Amino acid sequence: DIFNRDPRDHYDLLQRLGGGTYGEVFKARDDLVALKMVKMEPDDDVSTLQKEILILKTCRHANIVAYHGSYLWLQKLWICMEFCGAGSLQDIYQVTGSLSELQISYVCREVLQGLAYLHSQKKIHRDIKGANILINDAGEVRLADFGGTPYWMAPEVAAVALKGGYNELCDIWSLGITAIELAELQPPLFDVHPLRVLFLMTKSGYQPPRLKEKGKWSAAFHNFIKVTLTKSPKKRPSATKMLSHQLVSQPGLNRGLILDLLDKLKNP
Ligand SMILES: Fc1cc(NC2=NCC3(CCOCC3)CO2)cc(F)c1Oc1ccnc2[nH]cc(C3(C(F)(F)F)CC3)c12
């Protein structure tokens, strides 16, 4: 059901939230939602999204931003989703400064619960980072679902153009980098040219990154980083396995840690 009704018949529009990497997004009410709007242009064909649309509606979990349905009404696709009033962790840390280890430990647990669920549906997130971890005003954590010609490509080039070949354990690596990003306000190598990073990561002598200040963080955090950032995908622990890790299975982790962060945000 890709409705054609006009969003403005089910929802009142409240404030525009987008810009930057997020594009055009609206706060709205029925229950508060986000409406992301994409301008459909000439050769555009909604039916080519068919595949990546069913992947959304049937992916239902507390730690995954809920997808409520789409609209084409008038040259524009509108995706209606669970509203997260505080935006991304990147929106937040750009104001509050670095998260505490306990805040990061709660975020990691909630993300790993979401990743365990996506991996169970044979979905790979592919884009874990501060910008794609959303926070609601209750301090709860939700993973955001964003996203030349092929006419001459061999079918094996086409397969890679889509998939990659790699598997869901790439999300575990991205979570490690995100944990460092939440601690230090940038991923490792952020000041290094992207091409150079690709080449360096590609060497067999590449050292996985680390937390810069050793003394600031518990051995459990250093160990969480060391194991999430396992070079070999074959020895890298799963989401489910990572959720028994000391850092994320410690008691005291709850949304209070984030309500704190949100107080600090509006009272900086
Ligand atoms: F998470 C969002 C963050 C931002 N932040 C931002 N920082 C700098 C800016 C440039 C400088 O000016 C000020 C803002 C541009 O924007 C903007 C957004 F619109 C965001 O989207 C949502 C917001 C709230 N509930 C949602 N639920 C789902 C979603 C998304 C969907 F919008 F894509 F649907 C993401 C999945 C969603």
Key words describing this protein structure:
monomer, 268 residues, alpha+beta, Phosphorylase Kinase, domain 1, Transferase(Phosphotransferase), domain 1, five-stranded antiparallel β-sheet, two-stranded antiparallel sheet, 10 helices, 13% strand, globular, binds ligand XON
Shape: globular
Give the CATH H-level superfamily of the largest domain.
Answer: Transferase(Phosphotransferase) domain 1
> How does the helix and strand content classify structurally?
alpha+beta
Helix count equals 10
CATH topology (fold) name of the largest domain: Transferase(Phosphotransferase), domain 1
- What oligomerization state is this entry in? monomer
Helical proportion, percent range: 25-40%
Separation of the first and last Cα atoms: 44 Å
Bin the strand percentage.
5-15%
CATH class of the largest domain: Mainly Alpha
- What is the H-and-E element order? EEEHEEHHEEHHHHHHH
Radius of gyration: 20 Å
For the biggest sheet, the summary is: 5 strands, antiparallel
Give the CATH architecture of the largest domain: Orthogonal Bundle
Count of DSSP E strands?
7
PDB class: transferase
Keywords: kinase, inhibitor, drug discovery, transferase
Assembly: monomeric
Entry title: Crystal structure of human MAP4K1 with an inhibitor, BAY-405
